[PDB]
Ligand SMILES: CC[C@@H](C(=O)N1C(=O)O[C@@H](c2ccccc2)[C@H]1C)[C@H]1O[C@](CC)([C@H]2CC[C@](CC)([C@H](C)O)O2)C[C@@H]1C
């Protein structure tokens with residue numbers, strides 16, 4: 632039996648706390664012995680505690696500081712996503728030569744609560760270490776926001792133009808994969824019919840020429856989603872007295888992957904029961 636959503640959220644924030652405390656050993660104890668770290672996306676994984684120590688020690692020596700945002704869960708018993716800002720320099724650099732990077736970390740926690748995998752999404756356009764251009768990263772972050780805009784405008788035909796016929800999507804992570812534009816059309820049609828509104832917060836790109844992610848605050852009519860969420864352990868609040876007036880709120884992170892033609896061919900949404908609220912009335 633897998634760690635509760637709130638426990639996985641605790642582990643993600645604890646990682647930041649132990650990094651911040653400068654505790655190399657303490658940090659390492661949070662990871663499984665054979666854990667994998669990918670940072671940034673589009674690099675070889677670091678594998679195992681010896682390798683992780685080699686990777687983290689220089690950052691600890693550079694007084695790395697991590698300022699976490701809000702964590703998001705999933706319905707897979709394992710995943711959690713944490714936006715953060717990370718500041719660091721060479722050992723003993725003044726603030727002048729410390730760079731700051733916006734990231735979103737994806738962690739997969741084991742049954743015992745230890746981190747099995749960590750993938751860190753951030754692009755050059757998310758970091759003060761460089762002003763080099765990366766038009767592709769910007770394009771992908773824009774596409775993530777454009778999804779929300781088209782849903783909000785009720786423009787299902789428009790939304791589908793962003794997507795590949797080969798689109799695989801999963802909502803929430805830990806459900807199942809749906810394939811194809813007609814499935815996306817049905818999902819989007821249900822969203823629009825439920826008065827879904829998707830308000831985007833923060834974006835980051837991955838450095839793999841493929842990924843981007845956006846934080847989203849959504850609302851929608853309590854019916855029909857609420858009773859379905861309740862039945863599948865995704866809404867643990869009491870039912871509203873009048874389901875016809877109530878709204879559901881969901882905080883999530885949407886990760887997208889973009890193909891060789893600039894179309895979105897992968898989409899995942901990270902949220903769980905602890906990310907779901909009820910606006911009643
Ligand atoms: C049936 C539809 C809904 C849905 O998938 N699910 C659901 O109820 O129950 C989940 C579920 C999961 C496992 C088992 C059974 C049910 C899942 C299928 C959700 O889908 C919506 C509306 C289309 C969209 C809007 C934004 C977004 C993220 C919140 C995502 C980026 O599309 O989800 C919100 C709605 C709660």
Ligand code: NA
Nearest residue numbers: 755756758761
């Ligand atoms: Na930059």
